[PDB]
Amino acid sequence: DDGELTPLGNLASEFPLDPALAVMLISSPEFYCSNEILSITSLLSVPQIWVRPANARKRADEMKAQFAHPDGDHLTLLNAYHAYKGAEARGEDMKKWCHEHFLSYRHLSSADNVRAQLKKIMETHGIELVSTPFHDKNYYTNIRRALLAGFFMQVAMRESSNSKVYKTVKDEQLVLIHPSTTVTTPYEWVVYNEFVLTTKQYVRTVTNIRPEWLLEIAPVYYDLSTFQKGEIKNALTRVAEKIRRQQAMKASKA
């Protein structure tokens, strides 16, 4: 509050990335998805690997649907990175695989180098690297919680059930979802890694998250006492009240 740099700020300055990405990598040890969160942060730091040529738009869309995940665009990017790593381990050519899957080999190599640098920095700083099991059903929830803790500032909520327009809490920004998003069904909360202002206001790289999960990840930023206008903050306060009632019922039953 006095502007002094804390140990978290020193770690974020030492890490060669954004403060939000550094906070996500720091909070990933609590979510036990450190490797996946580091890969996602490296992919976000590296340029866009999705290639959509005009003469191969159908092939690019088919490759994106094959390598996509329903949890979010970040989950789809993580699945694409995992598929590229699996192809590299199996011995297929990286450039040929990227051309076949409409991916960028240079962007994938840059993301791999950034992930290696982040892993080296975490090993130097003593940050534990953990990953949830694939058969465990809480891996996607842990990844979503880590993403919400990393980027809780850029979170959008749907205005209505009949309207696809979302309302980001950052200065009450009315935006939409980008057409490159892999989420077929829009989420109640969308954590957006990038916001692009154009003729149509759309948000790209959106991951699914709940208001209760966002409030648990960032209680200081999403505090209901300091919550301003409007109905999105009212719904967040209602979700917090429901969570408090559930906790009271659990305490009464325990």
Add this chain to the structure above:
Amino acid sequence: SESSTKNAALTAAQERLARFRALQARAKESSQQNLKEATKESQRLATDPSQLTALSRKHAIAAHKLLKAEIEDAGGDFERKRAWDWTVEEAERWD
């Protein structure tokens, strides 16, 4: 014997875990396909078929304009090419 029973139980548990993983994958695939089927329940509650027949009519008339455009662009007579296909009843009504 007990070691043979333990080995049989271990192999059975390995088969059970394989069945569990296959059931998980099939359930995820069915859930995705059925969410898509929900979008067909919705998205046809959006696309009431009257609008579909209407857009088919616009497709037909615009494709008719296009086909006529390339016929006189290549130089053929569109009305002679249709004259090969008018019926007797249609021709009498047109006269």
Add this chain to the structure above:
Amino acid sequence: AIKPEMEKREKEARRKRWQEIIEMTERKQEEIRNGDGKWVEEKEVMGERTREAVMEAMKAGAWKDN
């Protein structure tokens, strides 16, 4: 001086415009051919609640199956 080139301009203007109308019609045709938020987070919340019910059931010993 201007008439032939603007005749050509309106010609391919017509061509491109109703070609785009056509392309919109087959994109809606494909949308029909291949065919919410409160829904999907309600499904997720009942799934986690059912899991929590499962863990409390075998934490309290609720084995009454047949």
Add this chain to the structure above:
Amino acid sequence: ITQHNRIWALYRPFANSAEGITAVKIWRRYMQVHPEDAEDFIELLIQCGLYTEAVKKYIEILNNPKFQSKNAKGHYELWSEMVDLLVEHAVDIETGHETGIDVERIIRSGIERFSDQRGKLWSGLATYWIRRGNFDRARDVFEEGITTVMTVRDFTMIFDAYVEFEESVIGTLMEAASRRAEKGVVDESADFDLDIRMMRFEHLMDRRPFLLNDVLLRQNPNNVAEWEKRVALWGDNKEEVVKTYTDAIAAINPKKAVGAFHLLWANYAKFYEKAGDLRT
């Protein structure tokens, strides 16, 4: 009674500070004098642990067709409150006619009233039964809702709840059977029971698209493509193919059909012809 307004206005913050059984006795008398803060008394009952009286109060307030929630909670929001409190404390609800609580009857009343969230109410009843521990009755009401659901969305969220519940319980018994298996402990109640559970799950999951097609044709009894998909799923069993085709013939209105009834009839005729039967 005229001064009781002031006297109660000074009485209620004493209850809010004192809490507990004394406060719920206070606010029961406050409902005797002035029934307006039902949601607040719901909160006190949830905090105290009187969920049976909370369910009875739920029934009384919802039976009274004049209550308006001050927190903008609708009828379905109240129904969600009943099913959520019941599933959060299933073991703390004393059922029977003496308390007036009948969970199956109230949830079936919700089924016949709110048809939009019928699958949600079925899942709530099933999760209530598995919270109580009555797994076989959960499965019975589960298959009843599966057979009597007319919505694909409700059917498939029900099946997703089935997948989660059965997968989690059989996983827990994987750890149980494994930790009994390094020490060589096994009997009929573990190995044979696990075999028959996976038999049940495999055959019900194979019959899941049959029930999905049944739900689809119950939603719309005119989908020629759906009937063709169902009979192709039936496959080589000739009597079942014949009866599903017969139901297709005496099920689709030709004027209201939305598919290719001519193609369906052609498949039926060519099936009999390529089998053996030129006269028919």
